[PDB]
């Protein structure tokens, strides 16, 4: 099969960008997200004992 | 007028972006992985077998997470409808209770969705890390 | 106005939190377990096999328990609807009977849900205990 | 007013409790059995195989019997609706026959459900008895 | 008023009982067979295999015949509805044809249901007879 | 396991009744039903060439 | 009044009986075949295997042809409905085309249904013929 | 198992009738039906080039 | 794994109750229910030849 | 009045016949093939294996192409309905857009259906050709 | 099994017709249809860049 | 792959918290819940013989 | 009048054509591939095995992408409906939020659809390239 | 099987066109599309932090 060098080049570039985004995901974004969300959970908004406090008015 | 439940609408406001983020990272990682799959050859496929097993996981995570997206619109639709019936049938108290049951549930879900997203990042990171050698170089 | 069956509403009130509790613990335990899965290797996978079998259980328990959450809103919706028809068709007595059959059933379900949740904690504790060695150290 | 077929309503009154009873015993027994499952080990799994086969049975019985509980509300709902249309379309005789067809059917089902519950107790007792040794001591 | 198709109503009056009869015998026979299943043992399971194959048959027959029961109420409901639309839309002739097509079909079904019931007794008798030795004494 | 004599008896009775009902089903009821239904089918009610004879009035 | 498409009504008139015919012959033949199945024995099951393969075919043919029976009522129902909307929304021309599309389709189906019935008889005759020896005498 | 003499007979008859019906189906009915239907298909009713000839009036 | 003696106790208790409930189920409850229901079936309520005696009024 | 999209209506007029053609040829070819299947024998089944694989293909092509037939009526129905709501809710612009989205989609489908029909003839011809020897003479 | 001479003949005739139709399908109809449809696709009707040219009026 | 000390740290922290929560679930929470629920069931609310005591007023 | 969300409408305008493109290329490539499948022969089927594995991929890609086509019409339909209810029930604020949730979701999906399409071209190019030898000459 | 020369030719032509389109798809179109789409994504339209900017008026 004949893949002209400039076409293969378009692919190689996508492929490098992807490797880069991925080394970054593993080495930083993922550990960061795990920490952010873990905090969100430990937050008060996501921690209500009384769900009746959550109760919204239904004026009828 | 009967308004939406504020404490929840704001929580949905923080959640939605988090959902969008996993689904996208999860798509990158999967593509990266598929692009790592080597030429189908007759022998030496352990690494190939390893890529297939990780892949299985990514795939469930996706399946699981893709639903979250849509469960949010359903809330406003299900709620909108409950309030309407509650209103049209003010004698039926179950409709007012239903409306409050939907909010409580949406609240219980948001917590679970944030919990299940964190867990996806963790489990993914963990598995990609442990088997990186073979995921990146299935044959050597 | 026609009100909800109070005897049931209070039982639901005590139940909802218990459901939220299992689904969360069951999620932690599952994550803990997946994070325990070792690098995919060619030999020595008995322990890995053991984790996979426990995992299967956790997964059913989840499937089973996830439904409970939603069965509660359905009650108020199905009931709200029965009262409404009962009201609109006061000559049709089956709608009054239907309304009472829903309460009786919700009462029997609550008991079954409490029963099936106790049983999840029991079965899970039991299986994680018996196979802890391999769940924690699948290879040694 | 059009009332419920009482001949049936009373039968429904004796059956419902019997259904609740099987489903609960069937849950105890199952839990007892799961709690009997031994540590996953490499050899000597005949007994384990025996527990798995009885388990399969308990599980079908459950599946079968769980439906009965809900088929009862459906009767009143389906009937309530037939009566209503019958009423709104008094010229349509099929609706008047439908209601009678529903009653006959609900009658024939009750008999079947009582028959299928008796059979559950019988088959369960039988199988637990025959294989008790291994169900209780899968390894010795 | 528009009445039910008498001719079919009488056929139904003869069929319903025959259906009730098969489903009950088919349940006895099945129970009898399950109670015949021997203690799960390590060897000598040909007879056991034989019981499992007959059982498979009983189970399809059940599946097949259980439907018949409900297809009868559906007829009156589907017809009741056709009659009603036909009446509300007297300009639409397809609704008058629909009713007639429903009758013809219900007639052709009844013949098929009687045919499929005869065939169940036949096939069941035959198979139980041929393998009675092993169904009753799977081991000797 | 301890199964009381009176309780085992309730079961033994059921299992006998069931065996009897079954010897009868096979040896008689089944051959009988196969014949009855076979006859029903060969009957005129279940044998109409013109289904337009089956046609019921719909006065609208 | 808007009438049915007669050209079609008459074709349905000739087809319906042909359908009833296949489904009944296909039921005899099947019963015949099942009654031919020999006592389950340990060896010598080639013949048995032959009966099972033919049986598989009969079963698809049945599955395929059973549908035909109901696709006919659906035509009048779908059509009756199209005409009604067409009438209620005379400004919407798509409802007028829908009716015509239904007729054209019903016409094309009839031809296919006649074609698929002919083919059943042919394929059935052919296979029962080729393997009659073993179908009738699986063992000798 | 005890299957009385008259009952077994009921069954034997059903199986004979069935064998007969079947020899007939194969040796005659099937070849006949294949020919009838094959003709129906080749018939004009089931052969219209212009389906716009099939078009039915719908006055609104 | 460390399961304190009091926690293990809660479990041991549940586990004993279950074994007891089960010995009782097999040895008594089940044989009892098989008999009760078997009787219910043989009862007239559940044995009506004429289902048009079961027929309920529908005044319209 | 709101009329059908003519540009499409004519394309549907050229497509429908092409669809009818494939489904019929595909049915002949399949029958021919089935009629080619030899007596079930113990050895020498490669050719039989070959007929079974071609058969699998014919069967998918059928499944795929059978759908096309009905997707056409759905267009007019879906469209008829959109136009109606658009009309009843002239303030809702999405209904206006929906109608146009339907046309564009029906257009993109017709092209795809013509494309997938050409491909069926191609692939079928190709496969029957390559394996004609065994499809016609599976044994020699 | 006894298949009469004339009945077998009905079948023989169908089977021959089918073989003929099939030799024709493969050797001609199929290559023909592949070409016709391939042309249809390359046609302008099935080739519109602007689908807003396809846009039909909705006067409301 | 390069996993940064601080990023790895975010993960290590999560992974420890999870182990801790889990040792606690097994050694205490689970045995506790099994007992609580087991009691709830043995309670009167969840133990009503007459469900027609559960009957709520409709009034229509 | 209530108009569509333009920002979204234009994005859909750029997306639709991209979808049409993948589905068509993916159909050519697939046909090419099938036409590459060699005469079914007894030995030497590795290459055939290779074509079958690539084919599996093309097939998922197709399944995945075919859905995108239709998800676009659904948006306008679901939205049109939300606006209508919002309008008819101006007191219900959840309907006003639902409309906005639909837009936000359609926006997030478009991005995902563009992402999943790019990914198909990539994954496909990649796999066809790596195994071209065998896809084109499965035997040599 | 007899496939007429002009008929085989129709097929040969299709099969060639397809091979050609395919060599072109792989060697050029695909690498091109991967690049185009990748750019679209990196574009502002498909990159809005605030989706409330996306918010459309719903005057009621």
UniProtKB/Swiss-Prot annotation, chains A, F, H, I, K, L, N:
Induction: By IFNG/IFN-gamma. Belongs to the PA28 family. It comes from the Eukaryota. Heterodimer of PSME1 and PSME2, which forms a hexameric ring. PSME1 can form homoheptamers. This is Proteasome activator complex subunit 1. Implicated in immunoproteasome assembly and required for efficient antigen processing. The PA28 activator complex enhances the generation of class I binding peptides by altering the cleavage pattern of the proteasome.
């Amino acid at each position: 099969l004949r893949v002209q060098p400039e076409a293969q080049a378009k692919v190689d570039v996508f492929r490098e960008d992807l490797c880069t985004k991925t080394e970054n995901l593993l080495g930083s974004y993922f550990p960061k997200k795990i920490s952010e969300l873990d905090a969100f959970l430990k937050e008060p908004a996501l921690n209500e004992a009384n769900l009746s406090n959550l109760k919204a008015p239904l004026d009828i | 007028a009967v308004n939406c439940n504020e404490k929840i609408v704001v929580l949905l406001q923080r959640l939605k972006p988090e959902i969008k983020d996993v689904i996208e990272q999860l798509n990158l990682v999967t593509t990266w992985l598929q692009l790592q799959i080597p030429r189908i050859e007759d022998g030496n496929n352990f690494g190939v077998a390893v890529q297939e097993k990780v892949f299985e996981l990514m795939t469930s995570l996706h399946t699981k997470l893709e639903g979250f997206h849509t469960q949010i619109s359903k809330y406003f639709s299900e709620r909108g409808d409950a309030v309407t019936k509650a209103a049209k049938q003010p004698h039926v108290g179950d409709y007012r209770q239903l409306v409050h049951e939907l909010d409580e549930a949406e609240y219980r879900d948001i917590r679970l969705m944030v919990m299940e997203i964190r867990n996806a990042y963790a489990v993914l990171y963990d598995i990609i890390l442990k088997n990186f050698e073979k995921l990146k170089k299935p044959r050597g």
